[PDB]
Design a protein around this nucleic acid. Sequence first.
RNA 1: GCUAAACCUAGCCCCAAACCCACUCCACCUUACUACCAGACAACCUUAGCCAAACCAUUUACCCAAAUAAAGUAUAGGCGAUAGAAAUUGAAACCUGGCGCAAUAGAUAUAGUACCGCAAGGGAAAGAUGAAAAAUUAUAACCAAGCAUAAUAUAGCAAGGACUAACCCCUAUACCUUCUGCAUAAUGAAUUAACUAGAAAUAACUUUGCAAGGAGAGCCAAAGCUAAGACCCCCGAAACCAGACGAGCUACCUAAGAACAGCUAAAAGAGCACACCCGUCUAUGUAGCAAAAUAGUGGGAAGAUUUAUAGGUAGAGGCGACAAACCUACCGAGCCUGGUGAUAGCUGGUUGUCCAAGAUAGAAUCUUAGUUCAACUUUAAAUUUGCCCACAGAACCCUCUAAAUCCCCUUGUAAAUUUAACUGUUAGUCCAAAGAGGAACAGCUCUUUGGACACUAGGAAAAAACCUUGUAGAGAGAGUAAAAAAUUUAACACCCAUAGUAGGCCUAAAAGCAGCCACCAAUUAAGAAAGCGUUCAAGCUCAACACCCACUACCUAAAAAAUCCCAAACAUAUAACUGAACUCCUCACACCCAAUUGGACCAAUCUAUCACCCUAUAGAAGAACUAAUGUUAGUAUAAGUAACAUGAAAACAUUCUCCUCCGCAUAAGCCUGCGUCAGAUUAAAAUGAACUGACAAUUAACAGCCCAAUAUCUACAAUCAACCAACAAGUCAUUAUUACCCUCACUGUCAACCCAACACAGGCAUGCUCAUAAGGAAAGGUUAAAAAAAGUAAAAGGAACUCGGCAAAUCUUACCCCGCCUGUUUACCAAAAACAUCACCUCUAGCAUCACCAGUAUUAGAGGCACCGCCUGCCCAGUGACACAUGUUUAACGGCCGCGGUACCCUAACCGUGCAAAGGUAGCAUAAUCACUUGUUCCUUAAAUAGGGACCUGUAUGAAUGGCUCCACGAGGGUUCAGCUGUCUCUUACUUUUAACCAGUGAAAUUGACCUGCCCGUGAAGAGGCGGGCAUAACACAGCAAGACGAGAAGACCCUAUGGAGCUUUAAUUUAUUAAUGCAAACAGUACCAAACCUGCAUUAAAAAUUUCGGUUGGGGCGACCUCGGAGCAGAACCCAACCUCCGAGCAGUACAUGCUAAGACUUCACCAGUCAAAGCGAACUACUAUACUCAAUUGAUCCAAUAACUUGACCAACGGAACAAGUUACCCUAGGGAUAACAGCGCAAUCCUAUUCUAGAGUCCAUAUCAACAAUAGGGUUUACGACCUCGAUGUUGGAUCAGGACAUCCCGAUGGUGCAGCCGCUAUUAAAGGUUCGUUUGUUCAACGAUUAAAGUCCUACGUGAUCUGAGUUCAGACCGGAGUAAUCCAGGUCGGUUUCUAUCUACUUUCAAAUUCCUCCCUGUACGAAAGGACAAGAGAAAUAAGGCCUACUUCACAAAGCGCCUUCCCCCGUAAAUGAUAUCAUCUCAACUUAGUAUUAUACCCACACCCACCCAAGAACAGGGUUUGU
RNA 2: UGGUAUAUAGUUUAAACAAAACGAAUGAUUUCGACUCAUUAAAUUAUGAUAAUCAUAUUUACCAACCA
RNA 3: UAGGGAAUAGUUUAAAAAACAGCUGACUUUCAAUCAGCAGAUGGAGGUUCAAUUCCUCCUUCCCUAACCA
Length: 116
Amino acid sequence: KKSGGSSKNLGGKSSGRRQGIKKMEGHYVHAGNIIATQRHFRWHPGAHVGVGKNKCLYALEEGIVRYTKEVYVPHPRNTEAVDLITRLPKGAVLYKTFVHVVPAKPEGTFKLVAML
RNA sequence: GCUAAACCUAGCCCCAAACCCACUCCACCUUACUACCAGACAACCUUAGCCAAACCAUUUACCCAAAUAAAGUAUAGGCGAUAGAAAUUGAAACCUGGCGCAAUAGAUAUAGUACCGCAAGGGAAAGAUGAAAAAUUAUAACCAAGCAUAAUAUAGCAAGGACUAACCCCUAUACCUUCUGCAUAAUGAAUUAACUAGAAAUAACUUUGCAAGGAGAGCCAAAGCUAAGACCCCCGAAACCAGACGAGCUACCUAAGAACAGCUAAAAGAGCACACCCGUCUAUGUAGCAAAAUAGUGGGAAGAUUUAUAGGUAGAGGCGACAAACCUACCGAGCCUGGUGAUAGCUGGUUGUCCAAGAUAGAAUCUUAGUUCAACUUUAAAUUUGCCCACAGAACCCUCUAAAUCCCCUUGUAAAUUUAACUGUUAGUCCAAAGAGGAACAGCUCUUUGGACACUAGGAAAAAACCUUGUAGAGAGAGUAAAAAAUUUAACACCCAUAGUAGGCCUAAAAGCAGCCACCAAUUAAGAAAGCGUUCAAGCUCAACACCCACUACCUAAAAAAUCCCAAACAUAUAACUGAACUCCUCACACCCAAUUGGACCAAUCUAUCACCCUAUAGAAGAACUAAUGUUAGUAUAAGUAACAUGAAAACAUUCUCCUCCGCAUAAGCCUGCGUCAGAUUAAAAUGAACUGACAAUUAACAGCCCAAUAUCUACAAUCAACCAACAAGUCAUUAUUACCCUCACUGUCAACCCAACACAGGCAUGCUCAUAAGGAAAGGUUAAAAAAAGUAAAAGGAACUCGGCAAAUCUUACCCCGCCUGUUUACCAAAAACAUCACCUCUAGCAUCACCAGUAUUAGAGGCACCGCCUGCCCAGUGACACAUGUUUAACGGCCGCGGUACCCUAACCGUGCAAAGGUAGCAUAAUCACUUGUUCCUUAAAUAGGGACCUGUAUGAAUGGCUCCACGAGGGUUCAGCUGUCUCUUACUUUUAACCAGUGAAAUUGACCUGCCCGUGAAGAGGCGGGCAUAACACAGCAAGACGAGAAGACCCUAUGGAGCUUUAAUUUAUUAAUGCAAACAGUACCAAACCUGCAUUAAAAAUUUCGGUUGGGGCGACCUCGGAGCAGAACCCAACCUCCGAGCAGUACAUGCUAAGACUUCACCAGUCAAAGCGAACUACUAUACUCAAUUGAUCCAAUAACUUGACCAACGGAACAAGUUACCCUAGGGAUAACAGCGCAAUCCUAUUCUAGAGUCCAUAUCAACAAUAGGGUUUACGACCUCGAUGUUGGAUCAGGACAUCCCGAUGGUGCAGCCGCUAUUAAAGGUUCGUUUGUUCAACGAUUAAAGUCCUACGUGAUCUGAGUUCAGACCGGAGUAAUCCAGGUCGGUUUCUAUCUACUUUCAAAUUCCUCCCUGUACGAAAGGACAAGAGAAAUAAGGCCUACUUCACAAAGCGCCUUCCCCCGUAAAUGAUAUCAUCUCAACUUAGUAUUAUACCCACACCCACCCAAGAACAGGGUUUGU
RNA sequence: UGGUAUAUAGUUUAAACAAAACGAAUGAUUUCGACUCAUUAAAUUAUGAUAAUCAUAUUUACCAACCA
RNA sequence: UAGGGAAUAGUUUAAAAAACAGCUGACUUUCAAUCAGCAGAUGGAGGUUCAAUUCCUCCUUCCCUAACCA
Ligand SMILES: [K+]
Ligand SMILES: [K+]
Ligand SMILES: [K+]
Ligand SMILES: [K+]
Ligand SMILES: [K+]
Ligand SMILES: [K+]
Ligand SMILES: [K+]
Ligand SMILES: [K+]
Ligand SMILES: [K+]
Ligand SMILES: [K+]
Ligand SMILES: [K+]
Ligand SMILES: [K+]
Ligand SMILES: [K+]
Ligand SMILES: [K+]
Ligand SMILES: [K+]
Ligand SMILES: [K+]
Ligand SMILES: [K+]
Ligand SMILES: [K+]
Ligand SMILES: [K+]
Ligand SMILES: [K+]
Ligand SMILES: [K+]
Ligand SMILES: [K+]
Ligand SMILES: [K+]
Ligand SMILES: [K+]
Ligand SMILES: [K+]
Ligand SMILES: [K+]
Ligand SMILES: [K+]
Ligand SMILES: [K+]
Ligand SMILES: [Mg+2]
Ligand SMILES: [Mg+2]
Ligand SMILES: [Mg+2]
Ligand SMILES: [Mg+2]
Ligand SMILES: [Mg+2]
Ligand SMILES: [Mg+2]
Ligand SMILES: [Mg+2]
Ligand SMILES: [Mg+2]
Ligand SMILES: [Mg+2]
Ligand SMILES: [Mg+2]
Ligand SMILES: [Mg+2]
Ligand SMILES: [Mg+2]
Ligand SMILES: [Mg+2]
Ligand SMILES: [Mg+2]
Ligand SMILES: [Mg+2]
Ligand SMILES: [Mg+2]
Ligand SMILES: [Mg+2]
Ligand SMILES: [Mg+2]
Ligand SMILES: [Mg+2]
Ligand SMILES: [Mg+2]
Ligand SMILES: [Mg+2]
Ligand SMILES: [Mg+2]
Ligand SMILES: [Mg+2]
Ligand SMILES: [Mg+2]
Ligand SMILES: [Mg+2]
Ligand SMILES: [Mg+2]
Ligand SMILES: [Mg+2]
Ligand SMILES: [Mg+2]
Ligand SMILES: [Mg+2]
Ligand SMILES: [Mg+2]
Ligand SMILES: [Mg+2]
Ligand SMILES: [Mg+2]
Ligand SMILES: [Mg+2]
Ligand SMILES: [Mg+2]
Ligand SMILES: [Mg+2]
Ligand SMILES: [Mg+2]
Ligand SMILES: [Mg+2]
Ligand SMILES: [Mg+2]
Ligand SMILES: [Mg+2]
Ligand SMILES: [Mg+2]
Ligand SMILES: [Mg+2]
Ligand SMILES: [Mg+2]
Ligand SMILES: [Mg+2]
Ligand SMILES: [Mg+2]
Ligand SMILES: [Mg+2]
Ligand SMILES: [Mg+2]
Ligand SMILES: [Mg+2]
Ligand SMILES: [Mg+2]
Ligand SMILES: [Mg+2]
Ligand SMILES: [Mg+2]
Ligand SMILES: [Mg+2]
Ligand SMILES: [Mg+2]
Ligand SMILES: [Mg+2]
Ligand SMILES: [Mg+2]
Ligand SMILES: [Mg+2]
Ligand SMILES: [Mg+2]
Ligand SMILES: [Mg+2]
Ligand SMILES: [Mg+2]
Ligand SMILES: [Mg+2]
Ligand SMILES: [Mg+2]
Ligand SMILES: [Mg+2]
Ligand SMILES: [Mg+2]
Ligand SMILES: [Mg+2]
Ligand SMILES: [Mg+2]
Ligand SMILES: [Mg+2]
Ligand SMILES: [Mg+2]
Ligand SMILES: [Mg+2]
Ligand SMILES: [Mg+2]
Ligand SMILES: [Mg+2]
Ligand SMILES: [Mg+2]
Ligand SMILES: [Mg+2]
Ligand SMILES: [Mg+2]
Ligand SMILES: [Mg+2]
Ligand SMILES: [Mg+2]
Ligand SMILES: [Mg+2]
Ligand SMILES: [Mg+2]
Ligand SMILES: [Mg+2]
Ligand SMILES: [Mg+2]
Ligand SMILES: [Mg+2]
Ligand SMILES: [Mg+2]
Ligand SMILES: [Mg+2]
Ligand SMILES: [Mg+2]
Ligand SMILES: [Mg+2]
Ligand SMILES: [Mg+2]
Ligand SMILES: [Mg+2]
Ligand SMILES: [Mg+2]
Ligand SMILES: [Mg+2]
Ligand SMILES: [Mg+2]
Ligand SMILES: [Mg+2]
Ligand SMILES: [Mg+2]
Ligand SMILES: [Mg+2]
Ligand SMILES: [Mg+2]
Ligand SMILES: [Mg+2]
Ligand SMILES: [Mg+2]
Ligand SMILES: [Mg+2]
Ligand SMILES: [Mg+2]
Ligand SMILES: [Mg+2]
Ligand SMILES: [Mg+2]
Ligand SMILES: [Mg+2]
Ligand SMILES: [Mg+2]
Ligand SMILES: [Mg+2]
Ligand SMILES: [Mg+2]
Ligand SMILES: [Mg+2]
Ligand SMILES: [Mg+2]
Ligand SMILES: [Mg+2]
Ligand SMILES: [Mg+2]
Ligand SMILES: [Mg+2]
Ligand SMILES: [Mg+2]
Ligand SMILES: [Mg+2]
Ligand SMILES: [Mg+2]
Ligand SMILES: [Mg+2]
Ligand SMILES: [Mg+2]
């Protein structure tokens, strides 16, 4: 009988992006394999780890994935990060979580091919 | 032992072969089956649609002249669904058979007959001996249901375990379907027999053959190829189209006919009133007399009347005084056949045994009742890891610094992935936990984690979701698991008090105690005062001393609903026992999940070959029925029930009694259908006969069946036809000339009769009779209960009944609304205010040989309004029409304002301003007119939501969509005087019918099976069937209607379906058709130019056609929403919903290598799409965090179109998008749904109600006489909501009548406590449910108001108790009006008039709770107690009444061997809330859940009933039957 | 019963610390008056809290309703 | 309860203008009319934009519509 009002909120129907870690600590990866996806920089690229447009971390070499805590030093051109470290107390250091790939195989080997 | 059972032929089916094709005579196209006369009418012309496309709109296979192959190829196509060649290639061919049926099969077939239908057309059923029936006292018996032989004994899904024993004991909630879940009161089923339902490609698998080849040309082939085997149901709509058949009913019309007494007036669409026509109201009837009737009452009855006969109009239609009427007994558009096995995402159904595995995140979708992908699940195969998991490791911003997860060697285990091939599931329930919404309600809704259920067992009482427990068998063995409810409450001090001082101040006063300051001090000891109190004072307590032991607790305070409480019981014998399908023991072992899937066996039948008292191995298939409101047949149940029938006596000769609705004849129709003989047949009836067989019969004068030609003639009604007067202007006639001498044939003739399925209470024209000279019988017999039906009479009253004076009686006044009037309509729920109508007005048309019309603008046609009377106002902006250059037109569609201010208020002549085409004029007005509204006032009634007259901005009155008056009329609606009455107070008596009993005959719906109880509880939420209790030998008959969610009709309300149809339109598409215009074509004439018809191509109208009308949704509608991104819910890998909470997007800017290419990866849970990228080529570069731009989303598939190419194109926003389609249905239809609303129940308790706790405030003071705020704690289930659990193959819904059952939260009556209780009246609380709780006016009302009363006129529940008991005013279909909405169809919370209420009782229950009675008033006490006065009791006692219950007839009254009331008689106990004594714990006191005493209690008292084979028969104050009483009154 | 509005001099009426209006008085003015002008008197439904705002009950207004 | 629209000088309208009203004068014996001058406005709050009656958002007042079916 008595009619009621409607909800005034629209949208909010987006689905999950299925982002996060794809390769955990100790996993074996091949060159090109995506290690992690993210919308903001939660994990930073370390050794033999590339970063794409969308902050996607991928393996540059074949090997084992490792996660570490390292000291963060921004690039001087980056003004937002450089305007933050100049306001820190003398003695403080910023830390961030980096992901690395420890290579497994060597670049190659020298083989005998002829005896001239 | 009956009924029955059983059979093998009749013939039929599919092929082959072969082309096929008459006859005695007579008759047959007119009314077919009819001997015989003047004619000329003639045949051809695209099938459409269902359906498919999941809608639909282009489109959607249908032999078309050779099997195979080419080939499902070329090609076509909303390039979708699907459709689909050819060239070319090139085979075989002996009718006489059957792994076909065998009487529900096979042809429908014993036959296109019987029968149904006007017609087209539809369309059956069944038989059974034997060699011989010229062997008929024959051919044995044994078998379905149903019965009989032979009824029954506490108790219960009917059995099982058993047992000496049938029953008694113990255990046990029918089946199918459908669901989250059914004993469910959800579906289907009476039962027996028979019949009745899974059809196939692709690929793959299995088993042979051959093998780089296979195959009996085609084709395939990187082990393939050939062959075989093995997988895809049944019934059902409303509809659509084509072609036939129908106007003997009905609607209208044509031709020529008929009927209408009597009276009044004599003029009549006049009145009274027969025949006749219609069908107003009431009752009855409701499977009937009747698929629309009967009785009574009513309307009309010389006209727009009624009616017989023949003919005409036919479904894309007709007809229509429009009711969406009627067109052969369901017309929103007929019937039949066919297309047609229409379609159905929907319901129902789906047939042998046994084992095994087996419950599922989600996405898209005109999609959420479905489907596809994924996920889960199954089988086969290959391979190698899967599950469990150690450290280490995974973010800052930030609020819960969460339980956890992700990753993961070891370890313990045995699964996992991949490949191949498939189906089903995709409508979820509770519990725990984390949360969202709602109300920190819901058996509520939405997500997540896990569990259980949808499988077994045990337990929690019964029990889907809680606990225990799972792997299957036998056992008269054992050990265990879970598993039983505990609690009982409030005593408390005694004793004593002098003084500075009335401290100071304030104050009228302030003295311990209104306020401010101080708060010192006397006495052994006592506050410049802690609580009451006083106007201020007085006055009473507390803190003090003394005395000596109060020598305490300071942890909780209640309860009430409705049929009947609910196991029975128990405080004391030593913790162990009982207890499963778990586990052990002896033996055995494939032997307990829906859908789905895999596998092992098999009945019968046919065929091949065996076999040979009924089998084997194989091959085949119409291969298996406890269920489809299934089909046919048989037989039960209801049920020997409902219902049906014959006037009397007698010599069967006749007579008597009573009806007379008639009767006789003709026409029509029918066709031998009560004449004789006979009968085994038949009626209720083993004389009669309408049935069977034979025989006979209706005789023409009545009637029917007619006529030579040509030309020609026919002005003057009828009505007693004469006066007279009319309009509606009428039914009757010849002559001339020619031709023409035979004559009585043929047919109908009966009856008790036709149309309605009937030997039907219906329908049926005319003449005479008009109450009969003709024709008929209401009672089978008895009894004389209820209820019911039809009548008669009724004391006193006289509408108090009721929605209403319905009905009955009686013979009557006045008024209002609507419509003028007679008239017409929804055959079968509406007769009316609706339609028509005289009159008025608008529009169109200047004319002839089939309508209008044999007419000509004083005409005809299309429409509106509705006689008359007074009137019909303003608007042409918009739409339309006309005219076309403006323009014209509303008696065409339609429309006809607002703001602010001013005379005290109200109002505004007036002032200011804007808009419009014009601004609602006259009039009327609380209306039949949205709501407000029961508006105000007068009349009317004792009392008025009624009615009438007025007042009235009515903001939604209003003028030919006609407005306002006024005669007459009305089965219209409303009010009323008077009278009348059984309508009512308040019923009663009698008669008839029915009824019951006897006799005869003998139905229907219904039926899972039944060995068919009550209470409470439980439960799919309302139990005869479950749990706990109570009750209980068996059995008929008559009554009742509370229940069996009783019977009946697959709900008509509501929702759903990409289901239908009707109507409307500014929905989409289209103009075939019709009309007009233009061009062309055709055609001619003297640079100009050609009539029309016809054809083609365009344009514009008209009138139509086809198709559709999205979804989500705490039912639908309205509103809102539909794609993408960020945040929270979701805290830590990923994922996660709500019509949940917030913020955003549908770009922009910079580059111009945002160039080419390419490993490896992520992925919005599928697909599609989307995303990140090393190296490399080529560039750039030595500075630019440059080498995939910044930016969060910043977006759109295929086809198609454009384009030379590159490339571009949709707010396809319903955003995975249909190339293009809206409304309405109450005129509606079909399929379903309790998956989904409205009534009811159930849950919940926000709202509502009640109580308690708290003590601010009110009450002069005074918190608790009384009332009560802010809040708190519980309970109730009467309101309004919310939820969607049972029911939509039906649970009938308001109020009232009838009868009431129950709760107490008590309205009166009773007993008590308190009072701001003097008394009389009251307020409040405790206890009490035995008894009682009125009549009236308006309203449909429940309520409410009012009038008069009462001791009181209680609150609630019982399916808002009760419709198989009633009522239908209201609500709530089909008709209609008003206002409003809309272009219209149509619609509204609106108002108004009208509108069919079925049921024969099978079961349960009940049908004498036998018998104590309640209250008011009067007198008296008493003018007493009380009291200033006014005023005015209780108790005791007495008397008289009312009601109720139970009886009776002396009188009265209705009546009369009797029954009744209006009359008379009788009527008997109590209830418990408290108030008081004695007296301990606690030596006072204290009514004591202390022992005890009293008010103060009934084994409710007693009363009633109490014997028993004379009993055939009769009588009765006894009674339905039976029974009972009497007969010492059995001629 | 329900909610929704409600209140201001003596009345009438904006607004609450109280504004204007009718009437009253007073003068100014006129030969005297009316008009006019000026001046004066005159009020917040009352109860409890915030401290002047919410409540509290009244007060009259205002619409709502058995049901099928 | 749901939904749409509106708010501009004291008043009524327009896309920051007019009209009156008001104030100041002239004309008239006086008033009115007339003539000549002067003033006054974007309900409220918040935000974008250099700039907002003119782009959005919430609140107040008022208006209109719907509030249905059994
Ligand atoms: K369809
Ligand atoms: K047959
Ligand atoms: K059920
Ligand atoms: K049912
Ligand atoms: K059932
Ligand atoms: K069934
Ligand atoms: K005819
Ligand atoms: K069903
Ligand atoms: K569906
Ligand atoms: K004092
Ligand atoms: K006959
Ligand atoms: K009849
Ligand atoms: K006679
Ligand atoms: K009729
Ligand atoms: K009538
Ligand atoms: K016009
Ligand atoms: K009236
Ligand atoms: K009146
Ligand atoms: K009109
Ligand atoms: K009438
Ligand atoms: K009587
Ligand atoms: K009954
Ligand atoms: K029923
Ligand atoms: K709901
Ligand atoms: K869509
Ligand atoms: K609720
Ligand atoms: K139902
Ligand atoms: K005591
Ligand atoms: Mg989100
Ligand atoms: Mg989501
Ligand atoms: Mg289709
Ligand atoms: Mg060919
Ligand atoms: Mg046959
Ligand atoms: Mg038998
Ligand atoms: Mg038993
Ligand atoms: Mg079955
Ligand atoms: Mg259900
Ligand atoms: Mg059950
Ligand atoms: Mg039952
Ligand atoms: Mg059903
Ligand atoms: Mg098959
Ligand atoms: Mg069609
Ligand atoms: Mg047709
Ligand atoms: Mg006829
Ligand atoms: Mg006839
Ligand atoms: Mg005629
Ligand atoms: Mg006459
Ligand atoms: Mg007459
Ligand atoms: Mg008459
Ligand atoms: Mg007619
Ligand atoms: Mg009509
Ligand atoms: Mg109609
Ligand atoms: Mg079908
Ligand atoms: Mg199994
Ligand atoms: Mg779509
Ligand atoms: Mg689904
Ligand atoms: Mg591992
Ligand atoms: Mg799913
Ligand atoms: Mg639930
Ligand atoms: Mg003192
Ligand atoms: Mg003093
Ligand atoms: Mg003092
Ligand atoms: Mg004293
Ligand atoms: Mg005092
Ligand atoms: Mg003091
Ligand atoms: Mg003391
Ligand atoms: Mg045991
Ligand atoms: Mg076991
Ligand atoms: Mg076993
Ligand atoms: Mg066998
Ligand atoms: Mg066999
Ligand atoms: Mg079969
Ligand atoms: Mg059978
Ligand atoms: Mg059957
Ligand atoms: Mg019976
Ligand atoms: Mg009978
Ligand atoms: Mg009879
Ligand atoms: Mg004759
Ligand atoms: Mg005769
Ligand atoms: Mg008789
Ligand atoms: Mg009889
Ligand atoms: Mg009777
Ligand atoms: Mg009488
Ligand atoms: Mg009355
Ligand atoms: Mg009267
Ligand atoms: Mg009455
Ligand atoms: Mg009458
Ligand atoms: Mg009339
Ligand atoms: Mg007249
Ligand atoms: Mg009718
Ligand atoms: Mg009628
Ligand atoms: Mg009329
Ligand atoms: Mg007019
Ligand atoms: Mg005005
Ligand atoms: Mg005024
Ligand atoms: Mg007027
Ligand atoms: Mg009205
Ligand atoms: Mg009356
Ligand atoms: Mg009007
Ligand atoms: Mg009108
Ligand atoms: Mg009348
Ligand atoms: Mg009439
Ligand atoms: Mg009998
Ligand atoms: Mg049944
Ligand atoms: Mg029960
Ligand atoms: Mg009986
Ligand atoms: Mg009965
Ligand atoms: Mg149904
Ligand atoms: Mg459709
Ligand atoms: Mg269709
Ligand atoms: Mg659509
Ligand atoms: Mg919908
Ligand atoms: Mg809804
Ligand atoms: Mg909408
Ligand atoms: Mg994916
Ligand atoms: Mg590179
Ligand atoms: Mg979509
Ligand atoms: Mg998507
Ligand atoms: Mg209607
Ligand atoms: Mg139906
Ligand atoms: Mg339900
Ligand atoms: Mg309900
Ligand atoms: Mg029920
Ligand atoms: Mg409750
Ligand atoms: Mg007080
Ligand atoms: Mg639910
Ligand atoms: Mg049923
Ligand atoms: Mg009580
Ligand atoms: Mg009572
Ligand atoms: Mg009821
Ligand atoms: Mg009943
Ligand atoms: Mg009625
Ligand atoms: Mg009515
Ligand atoms: Mg109307
Ligand atoms: Mg009537
Ligand atoms: Mg009835
Ligand atoms: Mg006395
Ligand atoms: Mg004592
Ligand atoms: Mg003592
Ligand atoms: Mg003077």
